[PDB]
Amino acid sequence: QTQPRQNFHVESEAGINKQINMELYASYVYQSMYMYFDRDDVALPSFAKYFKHNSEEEREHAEKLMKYQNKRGGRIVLQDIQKPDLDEWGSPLEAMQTTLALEKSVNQALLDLHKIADKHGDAQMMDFLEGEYLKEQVDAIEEISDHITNLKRVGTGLGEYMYDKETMSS
Amino acid sequence: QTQPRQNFHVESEAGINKQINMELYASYVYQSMYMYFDRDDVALPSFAKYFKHNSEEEREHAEKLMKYQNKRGGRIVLQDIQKPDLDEWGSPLEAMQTTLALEKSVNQALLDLHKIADKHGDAQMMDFLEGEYLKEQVDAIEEISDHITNLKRVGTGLGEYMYDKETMSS
Amino acid sequence: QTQPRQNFHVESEAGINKQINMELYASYVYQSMYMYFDRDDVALPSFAKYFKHNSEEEREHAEKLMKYQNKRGGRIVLQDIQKPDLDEWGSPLEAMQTTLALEKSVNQALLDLHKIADKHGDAQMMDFLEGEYLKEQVDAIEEISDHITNLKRVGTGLGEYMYDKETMSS
Amino acid sequence: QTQPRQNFHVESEAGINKQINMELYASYVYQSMYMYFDRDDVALPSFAKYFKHNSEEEREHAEKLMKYQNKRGGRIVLQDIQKPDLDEWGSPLEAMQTTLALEKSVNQALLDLHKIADKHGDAQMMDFLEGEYLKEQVDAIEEISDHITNLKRVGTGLGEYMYDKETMS
Ligand SMILES: [Fe+3]
Ligand SMILES: [Fe+3]
Ligand SMILES: [Fe+3]
Ligand SMILES: [Fe+3]
Ligand SMILES: [Fe+3]
Ligand code: NA
Ligand code: NA
Ligand code: NA
Ligand code: NA
């Protein structure tokens, strides 16, 4: 074994490599959304920055898992990062609905990864996932659900513009 | 020859004089738009200030070319500054559409002036135009295209008022 | 055409989409190198941080080209980001030699993209590439060449450790 | 029962007393290594301070478990602190290899104690161990593994001296 390795199962190691790819994929989706809201014919700059930020955050999520792989003595194996499903993402509301489903997909994958750690009695991996990943996911799903509700409330047009200036602005 | 003159073709010198007049003309158009949005029956003061600033910037564009003419040893020859095409400029959206076409006209003239410097191997004139003029034009066309898209999004009425207060305000 | 489009050829637009993918690929290679030097059996943390920062820089190179695509009125079309050629990168010296070849591949691709802008008389795109990309590549190729020379000078073992603590550390 | 006691099994209480002794033992081993690198014929003063600090940290680990025992209503029962297996610890590389084994033994003992808490549904004790012990052990095993790799890279002699001045300081 690698010299750090203790109580670290090959199934957990492989699950981490899968999750790494999924976090990189989500980063790529949010990068595409960022540049979609940066188009001259969309032009919602705070929506763009919001997805810019979330793209960067997902990349950090991926790198923290890579670091955790190394820390426990696993070996990172990278795969292609698939291009996003779409090239353009519709209305602000539609884009938020898309990211809710993405965040729920990542959340279920993290919960499935947590189950692997649990099967193999990997108490430290479970605590790492709960604190660094599962808490963030429930917060993200809360934030996106709020975005969807408000965008439905304000409607299309002036409402989308004002949401960019008020809520999406930092 | 004038004492600075080196690698500076009479066609480039004449092209600069033509471009100086065009920049002064663009300044005059934005001055008209400034005072149009300052009318009691239009009364959108941040739109007004935006065209005021753009009028001022175009005048400095013209003056920087005058300075460059002198720097290379050419001789400035001024012409009448034609009055703008209209006396009034319609809606905020219509005024922004007018401005996009103006900036595209100025941009093509600068590219045509760049082509003259290029024909005559005026490497320094090309670098001056790219850095001090072509980059600004690409940025201005971007900025105005965004204005048009947002004004179409927010619509007339409250939308124009909020666009004045949010985006157009400094 | 899109609103901003002027003097912007479809061949240049397509070339930018290709270059965006190449920059994202180089980011992925440096991310792999980052985590490789973060392995417990390599454990050169300033080499790791060096490749982490180069990965971040290459990702910003990609995003700047995405922004330029939008600014000129092109449409970003993303493709899969291919996984790096190797999972492990050898000695510090070997990884740097790999890095030199990658930056030369990127540099030739950028020169090839510059030539497309040149064919189509895209004066602004040429100036953008020169200032924001070509200068960086000459600097990076210089920096990696120096690293290779110094790593050959210090040799393996203590030399690699001291290079990590002196030159690679900030 | 003691007045705070609730959801606290006698097997967990006994396991805490065993783990307290092991943390005190680990502190004693690192104290011996500290003073070994302080010998006039070893004289690597930053290695010495590294093991000095880890000896203090292990003693803090023991006292945190003592406080936890009291907090939950258990009773601390102390045992002899056995002397370390050796009186002298060899090269920096050998001392680090010994330390990796020691930290792995402590980690397994903490995982076994976490298992006892889990058996008896002691949710609070598991969370305490996870946050205050298990995360620290994976960090420590990471740090020592890096030390071993670098000591193998730099070799004996000048390399050990430079490692003392750079990484260990
Ligand atoms: Fe994530
Ligand atoms: Fe101008
Ligand atoms: Fe690059
Ligand atoms: Fe301990
Ligand atoms: Fe927990
Ligand atoms: Na944009
Ligand atoms: Na007025
Ligand atoms: Na590491
Ligand atoms: Na001493």
Residue numbers in the entry:
A (entry chain C), B (entry chain F), C (entry chain J): 3 to 172
D (entry chain B): 3 to 171
Give the text the authors published on this PDB structure.
Ferritin represents a ubiquitous class of nanocage-like proteins that are primarily involved in maintaining iron homeostasis. Accordingly, ferritin plays a central role in taking up iron (as Fe2+) and storing it in a stable and unreactive form (as Fe3+-oxide/hydroxide). The crystal structure revealed that TgFer presented a typically 4–3–2 symmetry in a cage-like, spherical shell composed of 24 identical subunits, featuring highly conserved organization in both the ferroxidase center and the 3-fold channel. Each of TgFer subunits is characterized by a four-α-helix bundle containing two antiparallel helix pairs (A, B and C, D) and a fifth short E-helix that forms an angle of approx. 60° with respect to the four-helical bundle.
